[PDB]
Symmetry: C3
């Protein structure tokens, strides 16, 4: 006779053992967060309250760790998070690939009320301040996006530091500090000036709603 045992979250796995990762860690997920069954969370990850991780998302902390997703933020469909090796095989920090936020080191840091829209990708080292909207298909790698910024659909920041309150126009691929520093300011009449607030609201409500059903 058979006896079946079911794991309801085989998609929320843990870290594998590698020369740089001898002891597997597993995602720490706040109870209020909603991880879609078809999303994938692996390794040293920390998801906060009310985070809404949509289908096909892939948060994978197995090379560079850890990845942090703040409260009220959201990881939409297709979004991918990953980072470059933060530790070598001798247990030595690979400083170049580590970002620091408030005295804590991270391979990827997503603050609070941050929107990683459909298809965007953020790759460590990286940091994205609170209330920032990473638009559809955007890309952020080896950069530091400040607070209240807005990367419109298709923009990309690579190896630069976006100051707070700036926005990168659709399709613009920023790769020099000179350019970053000249980015436009988010004003009250800027089209995406309020997009984040709305997206956040919707997603936060989607999280709990999806939690019953």
């Amino acid at each position: 006779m058979q006896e079946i045992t079911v794991d309801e979250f085989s998609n929320i796995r843990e870290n594998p053992v590698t020369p740089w990762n001898p002891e597997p860690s597993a995602p720490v997920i706040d109870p209020t967060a909603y991880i879609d069954p078809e999303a994938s969370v692996i390794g040293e990850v920390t998801i906060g309250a009310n985070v809404m991780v949509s289908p096909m998302a892939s948060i994978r902390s197995d090379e560079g760790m850890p990845i942090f997703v703040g409260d009220r933020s959201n990881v939409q469909d297709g979004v991918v998070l990953h980072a470059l090796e933060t530790i070598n095989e001798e247990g030595e920090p690979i400083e170049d690939n580590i970002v620091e936020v408030d005295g804590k080191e991270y391979a990827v840091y997503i603050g609070n009320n941050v929107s990683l829209a459909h298809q965007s990708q953020v790759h460590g080292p990286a940091a994205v301040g609170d209330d920032t909207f990473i638009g559809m298909q955007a890309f952020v790698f080896k950069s530091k996006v400040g607070n209240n910024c807005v990367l419109e659909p298709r923009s990309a920041a690579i190896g630069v530091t976006i100051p707070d309150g700036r926005y990168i126009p659709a399709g613009m691929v920023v790769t020099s500090q000179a350019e970053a520093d000249k980015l436009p300011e988010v004003t009250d009449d800027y089209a995406y000036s309020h997009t984040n607030e709305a997206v956040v609201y919707v997603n936060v409500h989607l999280a709990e709603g999806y939690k019953e059903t």
Copy 2:
């Protein structure tokens, strides 16, 4: 003793209850359509005859509804469909985010014989006419793509209206009507002039073929 009950389509879920969506709706999928087991269809969706929804696709009608995918069309790998809140919490239409096709309102409307190639994304409000080819990695948001158009790999249309028979060159991000209006005409010698017909054919055959196996 145990008794196991299986749902063959947990990937074809329904809408959750939110302040703007009090009564969950579920995807209406024509019988001839093929929804890959690793695809995800959620909420108020209507897929037509012979549609081929490939792996990792995500059609998610939970914020702005509804999403419509016409007959003989196809949603390839990675494609994402989503829309902006079409109703507020008072049951008031958010007109700005609603598109109208033949007297019917939609959050996202994909006509017949339309190809949403690998990795493309279409976000409401949006409408894409019949026989149009939304190329690999393309992006269409707050726009209205006409019939027989061709958005080559990487093109993007944002807040503009592409006239019928035009095509957006690879990598071009269109964001102004001025530009949209000056788009090239699809001629018989234009390279992608017949790409849709082919893609449609293959996919339509892929749908039924995948239906046995």
Copy 3:
């Protein structure tokens, strides 16, 4: 009384039967390769030793076949492989869509030690030489990328032939041989000059590591 039978790899399916494909084929995967449970491999595919196919990847050889992924290479999250119909319904090769490598025909050919970073896409006809790094979100279609090249994040090669040792700068969409021929040479001080070696190393170790757990 019930008896349950489990398929551990419903994600590693086989080809369906179509007018151009009368006899289904199935992926041939070297034992050392690791195919993430949430990845999808379909049809005439050949994956080599130590390949690391990440979550949400979609390798789909059902239209144009076959797709080949050499030894020590890697298919990261979101990556998509697909090709244009290589055979018509009469069993006649559609020459235009077939690429040749060492006397063997392929719809898509990924050599050894090749990295298809997060979200990239390669569509047949295509060929990508050994030790090449197809950066995050890149796109390669109807082209032939040579050895030791580097397509930085967002680059794209369409219908061109990148010579060996070149690199396409971030965001650049190359679509003319003139342009391709003028691409920069990868030098020892080029930033991505060693990125591949590292990525390969990590992924190869991730493959085996993920094999225990």
